[PDB]
Amino acid sequence: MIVIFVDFDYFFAQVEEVLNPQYKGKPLVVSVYSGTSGAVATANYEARKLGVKAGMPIIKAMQIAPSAIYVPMRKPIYEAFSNRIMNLLNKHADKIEVASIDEAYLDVTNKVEGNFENGIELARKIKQEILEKEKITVTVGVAPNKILAKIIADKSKPNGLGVIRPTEVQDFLNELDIDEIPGIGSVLARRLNELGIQKLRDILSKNYNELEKITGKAKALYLLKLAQNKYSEPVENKSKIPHGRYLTLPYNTRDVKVILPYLKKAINEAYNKVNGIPMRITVIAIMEDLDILSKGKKFKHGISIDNAYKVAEDLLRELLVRDKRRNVRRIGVKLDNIIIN
Q1: Which residues are listed under the site Substrate discrimination?
Q2: How far apart are the C-alpha atoms of 260 and 326, rounded to whole Å?
């Protein structure tokens, strides 16, 4: 199995530089505020070094990057670029898994006839084409599985091209630092380091229960398997980017007879702006005081539109059997986990 992981380098910030060449070089920082009140969404490296990162309040960033160029967030533009690149990637693989607006996995075990050396060749052409047609740098990782593809990709960005051949696998995992593993909090890593866990292999030298009471069943199994490479999940041909259409009722109430008709229209519109069957459906109800109140359900197989109406109605019922004295002002639907192709 040959997996190619493609990650757009500080995407949101890099696009603004493509639309404003002059900014190229200076500490750019994509902001996300409203109402002041906001935070840092993205920032190129010329701004990262100055101590600016995502999640960091605009103020704290401004106080550490005054000369930094701050620009509001125009997601519709990023979305546009994202769609263009993702579809460009779709033709280069047997299966494509859109992890986010800037992350994707590709199984090319067939396009390269099972030749791992050609997967690197392809990942070279991919990295090239994106740069040509879109003027954007992406970091790529080429390894037997997703986790390895992503890990090597991080240790290689920006503009990098990480590679882990089938033979250098078990080796790579050994000298792999806990702090380089995705899914582990920077906090849980510090504690692990304090406990003597420096490399991923140090996990294969400690009572599992003694490891769970620190990490937890989830991450413990993940780390233990990862230290053996038994964490080789196939590349699902789907998209994890949410999509949902909301609608405002002719007047806010709790009358299912009035709400439902609109809930079904929201479902129809949500299905039109989607390229496949959703594996999860979430009914969102914007209540009189504008606060959100939702509930959803995930399915193995795809969820047909006719099933959507049924499932959605029950979800709507429940929300109403969970909140009283609160007419619904708006009602929408949010579809996720789309089974593409």
Answers
A1: 12
A2: 16
Of the residues 16, 17, 103, 168, only one is catalytic, namely: 103
Enumerate the β-bridge partners of residue 332.
Answer: 246, 284
* CA pseudo-torsion sign 60, 63, 67, 69: positive
**Has 7 been labeled as part of a binding site?**
yes
Cα–Cα distance, 299 to 307 (Å, whole number): 11
What span, in angstroms and rounded, lies between the C-alpha atoms of 150 and 144?
11
**Under a CB-based contact definition with an 8 Å cutoff, are residues 29 and 55 in contact?**
no
To 5 degrees, how large is the angle CA 334–CA 88–CA 245?
Answer: 15
Nearest to 277 by CA among 243, 318, 247, 310: 243
- Nearest CA to 335 among 212, 245, 248, 210? 245
Q: Which residue in this structure is represented by tokens 């398997």? A: 225
Token match 């504690």: residue?
191
Is 179 annotated among the ligand-binding residues?
no
Positive or negative: CA dihedral 294, 333, 280, 337: negative
CA 23 to chain centre: 27
**What Å resolution does this PDB entry report?**
2.8
- Partner residues linked to 294 by β-bridges: 284
Q: Which amino acid is at 309?
A: Y
The widest CA-to-CA distance across the chain, in whole angstroms, is 65
| Residue-by-residue DSSP string for 323-336 | --S--EEEEEEEEE
- The position carrying tokens 């990709």 is 153
| Helix ranges (DSSP H) in the chain | 11-18, 45-48, 58-62, 75-90, 116-134, 146-154, 169-174, 186-194, 208-215, 217-226, 256-272, 305-320
Q: Identify how the structure was determined.
A: X-ray
Q: Over 3-32, what HEC string results?
A: EEEEEECCHHHHHHHHCCHHHCCCCEEEEE
Q: Which domains are seen in the chain, by residue range?
A: 2-10+75-163 (3.30.70.270), 11-74 (3.40.1170.60), 164-230 (1.10.150.20), 241-338 (3.30.1490.100)
- How far apart, in whole angstroms, are the C-alpha atoms of residue 312 and residue 297? 9
Q: How many CA atoms lie within 13 A of 186 on its CB side?
A: 0
